[PDB]
Amino acid sequence: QVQLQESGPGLVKPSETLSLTCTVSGGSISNYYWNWIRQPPGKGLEWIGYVHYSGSTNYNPSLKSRVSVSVDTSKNQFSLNLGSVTAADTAVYYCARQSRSYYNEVITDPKYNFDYWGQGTLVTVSSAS
Amino acid sequence: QSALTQPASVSGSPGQSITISCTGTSSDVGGYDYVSWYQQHPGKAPKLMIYDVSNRPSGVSNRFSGSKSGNTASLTISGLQAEDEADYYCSSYTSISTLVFGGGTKLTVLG
Amino acid sequence: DGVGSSSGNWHCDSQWLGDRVITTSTRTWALPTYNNHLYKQISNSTSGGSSNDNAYFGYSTPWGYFDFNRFHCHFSPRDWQRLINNNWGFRPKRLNFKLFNIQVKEVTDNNGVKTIANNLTSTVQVFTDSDYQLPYVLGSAHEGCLPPFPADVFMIPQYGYLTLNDGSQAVGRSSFYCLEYFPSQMLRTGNNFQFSYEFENVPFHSSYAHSQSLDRLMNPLIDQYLYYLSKTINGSGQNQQTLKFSVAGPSNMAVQGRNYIPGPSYRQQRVSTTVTQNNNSEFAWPGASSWALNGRNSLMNPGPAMASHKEGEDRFFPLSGSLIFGKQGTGRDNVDADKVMITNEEEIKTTNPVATESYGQVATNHQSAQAQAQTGWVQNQGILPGMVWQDRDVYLQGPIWAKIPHTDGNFHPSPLMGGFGMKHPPPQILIKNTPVPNSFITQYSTGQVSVEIEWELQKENSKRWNPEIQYTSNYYKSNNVEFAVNTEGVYSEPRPIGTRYLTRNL
Amino acid sequence: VPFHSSYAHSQSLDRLMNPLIDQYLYYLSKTINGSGQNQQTLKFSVAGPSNMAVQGRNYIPGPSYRQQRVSTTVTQNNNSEFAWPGASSWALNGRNSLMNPGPAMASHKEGEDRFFPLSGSLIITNEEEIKTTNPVATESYGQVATNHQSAQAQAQTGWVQNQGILPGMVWQ
Amino acid sequence: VITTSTRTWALPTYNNHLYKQISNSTSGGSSNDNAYFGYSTPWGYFDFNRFHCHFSPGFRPKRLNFKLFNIQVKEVTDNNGVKTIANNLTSTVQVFTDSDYQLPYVLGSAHEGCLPPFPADVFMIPQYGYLTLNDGSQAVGRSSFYCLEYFPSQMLRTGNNFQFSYEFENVPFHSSYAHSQSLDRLGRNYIPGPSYRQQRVSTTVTQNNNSEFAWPGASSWALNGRNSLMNPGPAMASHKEGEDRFFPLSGSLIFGKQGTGRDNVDADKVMITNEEEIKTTNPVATESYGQVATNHQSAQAQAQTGWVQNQGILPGMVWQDRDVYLQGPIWAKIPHTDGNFHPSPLMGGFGMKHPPPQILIKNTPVPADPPTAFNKDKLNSFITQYSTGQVSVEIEWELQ
Amino acid sequence: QGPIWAKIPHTDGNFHPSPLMGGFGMKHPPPQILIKNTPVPNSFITQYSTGQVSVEIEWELQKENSKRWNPEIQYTSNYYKSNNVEFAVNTEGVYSEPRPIGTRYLTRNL
Amino acid sequence: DGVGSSSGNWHCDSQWLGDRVITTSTRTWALPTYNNHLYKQISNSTSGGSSNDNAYFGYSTPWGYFDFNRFHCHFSPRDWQRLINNNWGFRPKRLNFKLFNIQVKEVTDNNGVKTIANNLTSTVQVFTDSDYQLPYVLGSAHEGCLPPFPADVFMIPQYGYLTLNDGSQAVGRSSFYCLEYFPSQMLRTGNNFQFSYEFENVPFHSSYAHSQ
Amino acid sequence: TVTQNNNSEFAWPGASSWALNGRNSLMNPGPAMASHKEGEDRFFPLSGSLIFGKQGTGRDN
């Protein structure tokens, strides 16, 4: 039983950096690829990017400039840092886990099908308090 | 990249097979057999119904099935029930090794 | 022979020779003194026994006994892998038991501190029941067996037994047993004890999963010459009765005539491991399949061998249907679901009905012009001629043998918790500290035990083209190696391991 | 032929355990935390001497075909003619045949000797010697679940009146 | 008694010498109960499993002998617009027996394609294919695939022959008698055999209910979520004495009359057998087994009973098996399992753990002209071809 | 899918002749087998031949002696639900090999 | 021996015996006629060979060769699993080759349609190079080996070889080889060909991964 | 992943080769060497690792 939990501030003022952490419990980070997905309320999913314990990352081309994803193997948690946010960045942020690959035979990049998911956290980007 | 294109909603009567489709460009969908389908109940995280175009994980019934023709992949739900109403998303691996999702599709069970 | 000469060596290893395996296990044990050398009556009312179904009467004895009746006693995880990946079947042949390097200690409190030293004249009594005259408690899946990991030292269990009762009181037909009435051997610190046993002929425990399902045995390309009744009416209207017939063929496989039917069922309730989709009421006992004997209700556990769940439903398990093991370091009462490990019997679904499903239907009446056809669900089905079934699987943690109760008759004596049923199983080995004087010297003994079982193998002959499923270890990097001790030195078994990986045709 | 058994078991089928020791097996103790809404849980506990009913057992009692229970005290018995309608029977080629004596079953529960199976005894001998391995002729073999429980459905059971042979049965 | 037969066979070439996945979806889909997954092979096989193969219009088989000879390989072309059937002498035919029972055994399902009952007929050899584990139409990881090429086989040109002898394992003599007496007419020491009730259907349509109950009213057993009709089922008497117009819905074998249609044919085109011979020791298929007490009587409680719709084995039962028919099967293979009870197959005949082996045959593919420049792909271009020859099978029977 | 043997080139010297694409280097590998259609008459009859070939190799094995306690990594097929069984033919009858399979799973001490 | 008597049976299977494995594979092959029976010079400039690194000079011959160098020739996937999961090392010992049930066909276009029929007098030439005098092309991981699946019929590859060159031109040290100069065996539709080989002693391939 | 790789045609111009009699041969597969560091699945060493085609793979590009 692997459980993911997102945590972080629920409110972010525009043009400030957004930060979230997912803490995996029951299972270690291991060789898995950790992903961030966001769903704007009433709209479709969108993939932010992933991180790997080797420090490898891959980002969404539209967000590639202002986004960063970090991993901490010691604390068993990985993070999301999204800079220069606007109101278009209000969404529910999920952390997910790329499905385990049963074969070590070939060298390939990960193909994304998610095995586990966090519950998600709502993050509102607004000027008001 | 450009998102995958889906019908906004599809409905059917319980017991009747239903087919949802997602259209993608040659590079993103047409190009590789890596298309996933997720159902999301309201307020829940998406669940993986189908991966690698036609494969399905342990824990998913026969009733869910998927197929691919050209630039369009389709999800088929046979003998659908009440619990089968949710939002279904098409996911695809792209040429530059990025993930792209469909717009989402809402399935309504008439009754 | 002497106090300064060791009476036996340390043998642990496995020899894989052809069709046979020889597994030797040697453990270090410690035996205390139980009940201060006093046979004592025990019953439920001593603890209050508020339930009639819980009523028992029996005795607790000073003697200890050795129990090697679990598999991880004799097999390392690696050796268990070699067994299950390469073999269709196995079964024990010979047993060889040795007890040596006995040491006795005397416990004294001098001033405020405790003192222990060698008592070189003390003896230990040990005997085997080879006529099977004592109550046989080994086949009850009890705790206290030799440890899975050889570097652990374990505490011999205290022997005991039960007999007839009415409520908590005994009856005129009840029995009592003095183990001292059995001739036993007495051992000083230079003596050693050994004997050899011969397993009676038993069937190989099948360790494979069928690659065909009982209802798919047909040729998919050819019709059957047999006919079935396709239509009882021509269409909608009045007085439409008809009889139509069709060939049973590939287009409709449900109705074909078949030579064999799945094994018996006794239905279990179905529990989901996702709690929110479980009824919000306490149904652990009220909703459970049971059998009544002499006015007492016993839970049906694990029960007949039946598949755990339908294909595609992995979150469902029979309420009392399967064997549940605890994870290392799990509390005795009311632990969480994650702590326990629930085994599943999905491999035997090809021939056995699903434990949570009705066996089928039967017609409940005679149809007529005034009466529609009526059916009802078969919740339990005894044996019918032409049934086939698979037994329950054996696990690294599970029992090996049981003793077939001595009765006028039995059917398919194979035990329900898995393993090899035997009328003369490996005999019980009883042991105690000889009392040294109702005031005695506080005393305990320790020593070694080695056990050697010879297993016969059934090799895998299959012509299957594509590669098998095999038991393997995932290559993911983790904090601790599976089936190995952690930083604090605790050995643990991460999951239950079944025997069924290779396949056969049905 | 086998030697006829002329002895009574000192043990009962369900009591074969060692009373001093726990099993390593677990069972399902609690399905809810407490009273309220959304209390579902799964709790497990070791089967041990404290609760002996729920232990896993290697063998099970023999088959049963239930007989109607009749008291020697006329007052206790129903005031009606149940001699033929009441009696268990098996049908062959349209002809009903009373089941006599029937399969071997304990004549009566322990503690009630005034009751005897209607057609189940040789006439009145009592079979109570075999109540260790065999079910009572007047009792149900046990229960089985009749449905799938769910969030909307409570667990339901039903009484097994007759039971055929199962693997792992012993009987006298 | 020694029976001998001989026939002439014609073996086509299936799927251009190719193994092909077949499934529920391959055949058009739509039913979970009917879902299947498997393969079809280029191979054909011989099936003599019906009695009328060995017989002209207590006993049990003992020995078997099989011969295959007079091999003739025809090659077919289209020259202009006409087809030309020429002998090909150099070509071969491959045959092997599976005597280790390593392949799926399809001979026990009462299939068509048997040797014909009339010794002068020429029959087509049916195709070999098998089913494996499925989930819906899809296959699971445990499913297996067999390449029959991976067995050693004997290759036969036109002068070559093939023979082997088989030995039946000891089985009980089939009973071919009806007891003069009945169980209850002999307090009783024995009780009749087990029952699983079938719905009752009358050959007079006006008697039967005016509703569609072919599947709904049918006795079924569920396995892994798939319902299967109980057919023919346990051995039971077809009807009570005096009613011959009723028959158990799925409870009896049904054969077709000569030239009978495949679908939705009326009752006069098919022969519905009756088992009434066994009604002495066995319960009637459409009747309950008996009645049992459902409660404890008391001053306040009348005695209540209920009907036994199905009954498993009880100590002291006796029963008769299902009868064999000149059109019926001979043997079946006992599935390889931990345990079974009274393995005699339900459609009748002799159950065996090592039944007569399967015999597999195909025309060795002969390629057409390859190109003159090297290419790595496999050859899909072959000479249209089929073969024919003679099949003789001998069985020594023992009588009581 | 890989090669089995290679022929060690015939030279004055070599070091660790084991071939670089893998397999067993040999100075006298299995010999070449050459074949042709005998010409039947620069104008000939257009002609081709067909037949069978059988080959039998005897392989010697080195058994695994290890004392490792915990279970090995093994090559296994996952329990999956897919349209096609791995290492088998599809509906059109085409055989395929899903992934390259290496030889190295069991372990040894260094 | 005869036109109507088969010259050999079909053997495919593996026998696992103790420390040894015996893997037998039998395939159906088809051999065309290459280069219209003509040894032909080939070089890069024929295709233009624009790169100097690509420059070659050699010959293409009418012959064909049987290639079974790849592993899936001899092992099914299942048998490959049994090998790699249970064994630390392996190596070949003996080789046994058989060629039988030869059939020759003649191709004719009659009117507008093509015709093929048995030629019972035709022969096939087959020989092994056991002195290793010919250029050895097997060890270059080339295509044309027996198909992994036994139910496929395959096309024998056309033999060829290269020799020294400077650019696309040959040199005085270059060589030429006429395979007809080798004594070979000739086979009619009743003949069959076989020989046995002995692998030289080689080290076990190490099918294991270090744990340290 | 293609985005990490440099945006230039370095397929031949960046490859390890050996020269013989004035001709450059690519070094393939070359000496036996591990394909990548631990935890670096994406990277492959150019000509260093054997590459097989899947069933039905096109001959060129």
Numbering used by the authors:
A (entry chain H): 20 to 148
B (entry chain L): 21 to 131
C (entry chain F): 219 to 655, 668 to 736
D (entry chain E): 420 to 542, 560 to 608
E (entry chain D): 239 to 295, 307 to 435, 475 to 688
F (entry chain C): 615 to 655, 668 to 736
G (entry chain C): 219 to 430
H (entry chain C): 492 to 552
Quote from the publication.
The AAV vectors are composed of non-enveloped T = 1 icosahedral capsids, consisting of 60 viral proteins (VP), and package single-stranded DNA transgene cassettes. A major challenge for the utilization of AAV vectors in the clinic is the presence of pre-existing neutralizing antibodies (NAbs) in a large percentage of the human population. The presence of pre-existing neutralizing antibodies in large portions of the human population poses a significant challenge for AAV-mediated gene therapy, primarily targeting the capsid leading to vector inactivation and loss of treatment efficacy. The antibodies bound to the 2-fold depression or the 3-fold protrusions do not conform to the icosahedral symmetry of the capsid, thus requiring localized reconstructions. These complex structures provide unprecedented details of the mAbs binding interfaces, with many antibodies inducing structural perturbations of the capsid upon binding.
In each map, the capsid was well ordered, while the densities for the Fabs above the 2-fold axis could not be interpreted for model building. The localized reconstructions with C2 symmetry relaxation confirmed that only a single Fab is bound at the 2-fold region. The epitopes for the sixteen 2-fold Fabs comprise VR-III to -VII, and -IX of the AAV9 capsid. On the aa level, all 2-fold-Fabs contact D532 and Y706. Additionally, at least two Fabs showed the presence of a bivalent cation in the binding interface.
